[PDB]
């Protein structure tokens, strides 16, 4: 019965909107739910030179891209939370659901 | 290097002139008054405004405030 939903997004408050939506769903459908486990954030860091050519004073850009991850566990059959997980899909957040 | 800018000072003088009767000597209560009466968009700005409000009002009693 141990279904696991992994919510992954670049935006935090859009991730927290979908996360707080699925817990509201699990609780209003009377299901055992492990709260959202905040897995450590990953910082995709690339540092470039700023100039296209060579002859400017040595200046560097520092581009970052944070990626955030929650996972919520559920003790329930597949098709109930399938109807819940189909509800409230945002353009930003990315969902992956495993069964066992 | 703690010189308050025109933003903090003007906001403090406008808040006192409109709401003298609520603000007092205590910093923490009139932090909460300024929070409610003024839609201030950041927390550090609210604290600096509230800070200068309970400096102006703590000298209004002494006497000749100009601005």
């Amino acid at each position: 019965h141990r279904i696991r939903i992994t919510l992954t997004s670049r935006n935090v408050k859009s991730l927290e909107k979908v996360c707080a939506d699925l817990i509201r769903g699990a609780k209003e459908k009377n299901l055992k739910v492990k709260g959202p486990v905040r897995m450590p954030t990953k910082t995709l860091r690339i540092t470039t030179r700023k100039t296209p050519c060579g002859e400017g004073s040595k200046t560097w850009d520092r581009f970052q891209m944070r990626i955030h991850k929650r996972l919520i566990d559920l003790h329930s059959p597949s098709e109930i939370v399938k109807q819940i997980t189909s509800i409230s899909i945002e353009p930003g957040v990315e969902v992956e659901v495993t069964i066992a | 290097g703690r010189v308050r800018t025109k933003t903090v000072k003007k906001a403090a003088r406008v808040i006192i002139e409109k709401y003298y009767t609520r603000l007092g000597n205590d910093f923490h209560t009139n932090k909460r008054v300024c929070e409610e009466i003024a839609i201030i968009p950041s927390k550090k700005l609210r604290n600096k405004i509230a800070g200068y409000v309970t400096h102006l009002m703590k000298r209004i009693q002494r006497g000749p405030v100009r601005g």
């Binding site: 899909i89 | 409109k18 709401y19 003024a38 839609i39 405004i49």
Partner: protein, 228 residues
């Protein structure tokens, strides 16, 4: 699935997809009044929203252009057939889209309207659209062989700090004239609205608003208002 890309490489691949897609649509529909793209990856669908202004032209003849663009984007990016459904949506208040103005000015200047008259014309349209303030720069070879930069500003425009991210909308473009490339830079400072339609919902981080007090009248002597 079997290849099983990491979240890092997957999210960069998602970003590059948008980068190459934005390049493709900008190159083709520059002269059709195209604003931007939005990519909703619906359950076993890829619902690409095209934001335009003149949506009849990005649509084509009985949806010939859309069926054309759906066919090639499916072909290059290797999606399965039917799992790519495009949707043309005209933007309300085109005046406050930096790309719409920058690419329209471009097609006026190469058309044959004067540089000064084009800049003033775009500038007046933006300030009547309701931007807080605008800035149209047209730089390159103007009035001979040595190059100039003409700068047309009206109203308020901020330059430094984070609020530049969500109040100032920018657009840098190139136009093909016979002397060489004329570079265009259009800046639009958006108006603030609590609605969140045409501008951002966050007020400027130093614009302090004060509630004015209700000018009531003090009760002189004790009254009471008994009820039940």
């Amino acid at each position: 699935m079997a290849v099983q890309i990491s979240k890092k490489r997957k999210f960069v691949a998602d970003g590059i997809f948008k980068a190459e897609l934005n390049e493709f649509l900008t190159r083709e529909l520059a002269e059709d009044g195209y604003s931007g793209v939005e990519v909703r990856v619906t359950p076993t669908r890829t619902e690409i929203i095209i934001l335009a202004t003149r949506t009849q032209n990005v649509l084509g003849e009985k949806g010939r252009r859309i069926r054309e663009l759906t066919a090639v984007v499916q072909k290059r990016f290797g999606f399965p057939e039917g799992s790519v459904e495009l949707y043309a949506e005209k933007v309300a208040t085109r005046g406050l889209c930096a790309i719409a103005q920058a690419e329209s000015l471009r097609y006026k200047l190469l058309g044959g309207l004067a540089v000064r008259r084009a800049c003033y014309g775009v500038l007046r349209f933006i300030m009547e659209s309701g931007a807080k303030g605008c800035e149209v720069v047209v730089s390159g070879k103007l009035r001979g062989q040595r190059a100039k930069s003409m700068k047309f500003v009206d109203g308020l425009m901020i330059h430094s700090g984070d609020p530049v991210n969500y109040y100032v909308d920018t657009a840098v473009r190139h136009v093909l004239l016979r002397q060489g490339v004329l570079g265009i830079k259009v800046k639009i400072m958006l108006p603030w609205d609590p609605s969140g339609k045409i501008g951002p919902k966050k007020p400027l981080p130093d614009h302090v608003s004060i509630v004015e007090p209700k000018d009531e009248i003090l009760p002189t002597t004790p009254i009471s208002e008994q009820k039940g």
